[PDB]
């Protein structure tokens, strides 16, 4: 689709068997999801954003379905105030910014 | 422009006669720029993102060019890690997300 930006670009995602709402964020390097369980090994990471850093758990090779589109990649889990789909998965669903 | 997301969507902006680099961010409500001098009065604002909140100065009716497109709107100034172009100005330049 073509999403206008008059409102936040929120979509429904499926991850780890759960439905969630998430923000399509071209200004995010990574995909960051609120606390949930995911399978496999993980490692701690610090990520930064507008107000400083948070600590997250990094899981690899996770499949997410994003507004109907499947993609695979790294997902970070931690105390983010909003679920965000960042560039690592936006590229996989072929998303572009156009003007 | 059609901007893919394999790299950060960094563009050149012009504000106050000066060229700066900024990130096009569909996950940002507002436009936030690093400390600089802007004309007129300002008002206080708090904005929040992944690592918490920061205090910024809100300037209205600022003339700004984004990747060559002219806009006039609100710019927040404060200790952001990166200059961010948010939806308030991405809608002025007619940007959409497409997949």
């Amino acid at each position: 689709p073509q999403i206008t930006l008059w409102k936040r670009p929120l979509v429904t995602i499926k991850i780890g068997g759960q439905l969630k709402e998430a923000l399509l964020d071209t200004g995010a390097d990574d995909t960051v999801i609120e606390e949930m369980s995911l399978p496999g090994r993980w490692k701690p990471k610090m990520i930064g954003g507008i107000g400083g850093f948070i600590k997250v758990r990094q899981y690899d090779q996770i499949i997410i379905e994003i507004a109907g589109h499947k993609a695979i990649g790294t997902v970070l889990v931690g105390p983010t105030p909003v679920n965000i789909i960042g560039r690592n998965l936006l590229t996989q669903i072929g998303a572009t910014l156009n003007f | 422009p059609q901007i893919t997301l394999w790299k950060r969507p960094l563009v050149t902006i012009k504000i106050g006669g000066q060229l700066k680099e900024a990130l096009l961010d569909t996950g940002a409500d507002d436009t936030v720029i690093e400390e600089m001098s802007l004309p007129g009065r300002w008002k206080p604002k708090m904005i929040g993102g992944i690592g918490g909140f920061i205090k910024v100065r809100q300037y209205d009716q600022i003339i700004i060019e984004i990747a060559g497109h002219k806009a006039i709107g609100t710019v927040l100034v404060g200790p952001t890690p990166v200059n961010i172009i948010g939806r308030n100005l991405l809608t002025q330049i007619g940007a959409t997300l497409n997949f």
């Binding site: 964020d25 200004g27 990574d30 990471k45 990520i47 507008i50 | 961010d25 507002d30």
Partner: peptide, 11 residues
């Protein structure tokens, strides 16, 4: 590491 910029105003 890795920087992630969602933002919203205020309260």
């Amino acid at each position: 590491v890795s920087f992630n910029x969602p933002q919203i105003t205020a309260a």
